[PDB]
From a paper:
In this study, we presented a ligand-observed MS approach for high-throughput screen of a 384-member fragment library as well as reliable estimation of binding affinity of each fragment hit. This approach was integrated into a FBLD program targeting the RNA polymerase of [name] (HCV), NS5B, which is a particularly attractive target for anti-HCV drug development. Similar to other nucleotide polymerases, the domain distribution of apo HCV NS5B polymerase bears an anatomical resemblance to a right hand with subdomains representing the fingers, thumb and palm. Structural and mechanistic studies of NS5B have indicated the existence of multiple allosteric binding domains including palm I, II and III pockets and thumb I and II sites targeted by reported inhibitors. The proposed discovery pipeline combining our MS-based approach and other biophysical techniques resulted in identification and validation of ten new fragments bound to two distinctive domains of NS5B, among which five were successfully translated to X-ray structures of fragment-bound complexes valuable for structure-based design of potent inhibitors.
To characterize the binding modes of the fragments studied, they were soaked in NS5B crystals to obtain the protein complex X-ray structures. Inspection of the crystal structures indicated that fragments 114, 204, 117, and 328 all bound at the palm I allosteric domain, while fragment 162 bound at the thumb region. Fragment 162 binds NS5B in a small cavity of the thumb pocket, with its trifluoromethyl moiety extending a key hydrogen bond with Asn369 as well as making hydrophobic interactions with Ser371 and Glu481. To our knowledge, the three residues constitute a new active domain in the thumb region never disclosed before. A prominent feature for another 3 hits was the presence of a trifluoromethyl group which is responsible for key interactions with active domains as discussed later.
Numbering used by the authors: 1 to 22, 28 to 148, 154 to 539, 548 to 562
Write the structure that this text describes.
């Protein structure tokens, strides 16, 4: 069928939509835009097409292996109270007279409605369920992306999803997919694993695979298979019925309704704004790729899967033979309805492969020992940082990136300096800030950063020092390209900040001592002083 059909009703905004900055971070403010509903139509054209899916024996076999491992999982139902507590404070309200605030408080109005939505789930396993459709507001840098489409059901339903499936999507994928399951790794854990699986090959070859608009490529069959997998778990019988209902009424598809309550059409592919999205896309990606590997006689594959994002490291068969078996791999994925965006390409250097928007690089600690860490082209981070510092926003990408990319050259020299300067200037150091990690919302105290980083990256994070020439040129370039002060200018700014922080004692002094030792010249000695990287949840409406 078609991924979507349209009525012609517009995808409409809920509120005013900014698309540009209203400046000591970056000069070329021209280059930063936010996406808006103004670009919905273009995206609309890209995500809508027919899906032809041909299975084969490798598909059927990998699924059989997955269903066998899923049968070792036992999963419990979540009480209303637990499901309510997982709902973010600012999650979109219900069209039935209550908001997340009422949900979090166990207001008897929200809970009663939630009871009725659940009851109706058990009784009716057919009637499609209403979804809202929305263009996202996401900041990027020039050289333009159409806004992504987000699709999500009413708050009431979302809470039922949690009850029915939070335990499953938190617990199953790991067991089903073992070490391929990306969201069980912190960044140092992910580097360590990529690097070890690369050293483990006699003659290694790697390649990422970009599936073109993955959410569209997911078929209604795919979503029933995925259900068939959940069902292999030892479930409560009420969980079993709600899961059949949710999938048949919502996951499989349904009507799309814009912010003004008009009907935009009907979806027959993955909704992005549901609980099963990450888990769904990760299982569906692992299954197709694991099978595509077999079709292409790829020798000795290890995979890493994070939703629609896929890395494969295997034994090379020769550079010709490689290029070729990769084309077969692609044919297989295409048959399975996951055709390519960029066409995939072999790499014989781990450092050259990008996955989850990231790549492995290396530097050196105090002792000169070499250290691998995860980094990325810092353009979108800096872009969003400029946005976040200009317009006030609920989301703080900067902090997320400081946490994820603490070891990187750019996060230490630029993000850390910049934002500790603002916080010191605003006397807002003590305040918790919300940020996204593998799609879940965590409240974090910026002064905790040092221990957080020590815990997730090791102490070497505070003293890495001979960054690769490629990495240094990527940063410098991005700075010039963007109009951000070169790295030497941050060094001077950091000494100033480090100093102010040191003067305040307590945890600020630790922030200054640790975060900015790289900037001093004569170094201080840096001695020693989380259920966060377990599962993926973007679009799952989760808070911890
Ligand atoms: N040519 C490059 C480009 C980037 C990198 C690193 F930053 F990822 F290390 C290495 N070599």
């Amino acid at each position: 069928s078609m991924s979507y059909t349209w009525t012609g009703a517009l995808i409409t905004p809920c509120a005013a939509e900014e698309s540009k900055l209203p400046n000591s971070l970056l000069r070329h403010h021209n280059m930063v835009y936010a996406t808006t509903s103004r670009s919905a139509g273009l995206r609309q054209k890209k995500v809508t097409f027919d899906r032809l899916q041909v299975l084969d024996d490798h598909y059927r076999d990998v699924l059989k292996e997955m269903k066998a491992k899923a049968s070792t999982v036992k999963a419990k139902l979540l009480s209303v109270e637990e499901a309510c507590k997982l709902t973010p404070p600012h999650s979109a309200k219900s069209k039935f007279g209550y908001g997340a605030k009422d949900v979090r408080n166990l207001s008897s109005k929200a809970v009663n409605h939630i009871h009725s939505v659940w009851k109706d789930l058990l009784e009716d396993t057919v009637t499609p369920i209403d979804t809202t459709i929305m263009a996202k507001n996401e900041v990027f840098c020039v050289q333009r992306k159409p806004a992504r489409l987000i699709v999500f059901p009413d708050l009431g339903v979302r809470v039922c999803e949690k009850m029915a499936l939070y335990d499953v999507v938190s617990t199953l994928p790991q067991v089903v997919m073992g070490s391929s399951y990306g969201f069980q790794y912190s960044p140092g854990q992910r580097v360590e694993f990529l690097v070890n699986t690369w050293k483990s090959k006699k003659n290694p070859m790697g390649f990422s695979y970009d599936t073109r608009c993955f959410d569209s490529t997911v078929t209604e069959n795919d979503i029933r298979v995925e259900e068939s997998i959940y069902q292999c778990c030892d479930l409560a019988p009420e969980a079993r019925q709600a899961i059949k209902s949710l999938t048949e009424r919502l996951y499989i598809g349904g009507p799309l309704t814009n912010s003004k309550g008009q009907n935009c059409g009907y979806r027959r592919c993955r909704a992005s704004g549901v609980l099963t999205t990450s888990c769904g896309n990760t299982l569906t990606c692992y299954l197709k790729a694991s099978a595509a590997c077999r079709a292409a006689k790829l020798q000795d594959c290890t995979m890493l899967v994070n939703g629609d994002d896929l890395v494969v490291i295997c034994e090379s068969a020769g550079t010709q033979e490689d290029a070729a078996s990769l084309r077969v791999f692609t044919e297989a994925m295409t048959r399975y309805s996951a055709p390519p965006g960029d066409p995939p390409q072999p790499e014989y250097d781990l450092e050259l492969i990008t996955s989850c928007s990231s790549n492995v690089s290396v530097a050196h600690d105090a002792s000169g020992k070499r250290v691998y860490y995860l980094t990325r082209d810092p353009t979108t981070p800096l872009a969003r940082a400029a946005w976040e510092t200009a317009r006030h926003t609920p989301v703080n990408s900067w902090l997320g990136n400081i946490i994820m990319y603490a070891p990187t050259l750019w996060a230490r020299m630029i993000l850390m300096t910049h934002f500790f300067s603002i916080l010191l200037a605003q006397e807002q150091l003590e305040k918790a800030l919300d940020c996204q990690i593998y799609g879940a919302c965590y409240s974090i105290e910026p002064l905790d950063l040092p221990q957080i980083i020590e815990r997730l990256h090791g102490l070497s994070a505070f003293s890495l020092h001979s960054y690769s020439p490629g990495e240094i040129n990527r940063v410098a370039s991005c700075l010039r390209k963007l109009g951000v002060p070169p790295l030497r200018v941050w060094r001077h700014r950091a000494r100033s900040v480090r100093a102010r922080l040191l003067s305040q004692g307590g945890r600020a002094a630790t922030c200054g001592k640790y975060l900015f030792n790289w900037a001093v010249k004569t170094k201080l000695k840096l001695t020693p002083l989380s259920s966060m990287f377990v599962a993926g949840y973007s679009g799952g409406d989760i808070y911890h």
